[PDB]
Write a protein that binds this ligand. Structure first.
Ligand SMILES: NCC1(c2ccccn2)CCCC1
Lengths: 39, 156
């Protein structure tokens, strides 16, 4: 039996840590919901 | 059970100890997560039971107690926040400018942030605090880093 536990509110935080890049990728989505890279 | 709006961890006692298999969003009485987190199984909230209502393996999404309620979309220009809820760690907001997944059926926003597998289902938000999608279904690129789609359902 899976169970859920509250972890917090959903709100935008001012002064949150800013990170991560913004890649543009050609991708394919199969019938099983799996994404793969297209080259 | 606890029906307060917010972000929740999805836990299981089937494996060793209590393991976090994912995360989800409770909004308007409906629990929203990714299909690969629960595989469509029923969930427990205290002494209450949450039954699946809608789900789709290809979209990799599932809703409990009612239809999918989340309909905000990334505007294609602004920074967003991943409200990451990692296993055994406190919820933390991470701001990022999404990249793009280009598909034969159109383009999708994508966030290049790497977290443990049990973080799947963590919400991605806009500046109004609205959930524009869930984190956790994506791809691994050349450098071995993870890039997740910003996966959003359809509000009927
Ligand atoms: N970065 C670890 C992985 C993941 C999956 C879903 C969500 C977040 N991280 C596990 C499988 C490969 C990528």
């Amino acid at each position: 039996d899976m169970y859920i536990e509250r972890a917090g509110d959903i709100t935008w935080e001012k002064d949150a840590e800013v990170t991560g890049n913004s890649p543009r990728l050609d991708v394919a989505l199969d019938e099983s919901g799996d994404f793969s890279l297209v080259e | 059970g606890e029906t307060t709006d917010g972000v929740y961890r999805v836990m299981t006692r089937r494996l060793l100890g209590s393991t976090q298999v994912g995360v989800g969003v409770m909004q308007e009485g409906v629990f929203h997560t990714m299909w690969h987190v629960t595989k469509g199984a029923a969930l427990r909230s205290g002494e209450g039971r949450l039954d699946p209502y809608w789900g789709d393996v290809k979209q990799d999404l599932v809703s409990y107690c009612g239809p999918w309620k989340l309909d905000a979309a990334w505007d294609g220009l602004s920074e967003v926040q991943l409200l990451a809820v990692p296993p055994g760690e406190r919820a933390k907001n991470i701001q990022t400018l999404p990249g793009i997944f280009k598909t034969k059926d159109g383009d999708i926003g994508a966030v290049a942030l790497d977290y443990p597998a049990g973080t799947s289902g963590s919400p991605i938000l806009d500046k109004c605090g609205r959930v524009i999608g869930l984190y956790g279904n994506g791809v691994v690129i050349k450098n071995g880093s993870y890039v997740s789609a910003i996966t959003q359902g359809k509000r009927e």
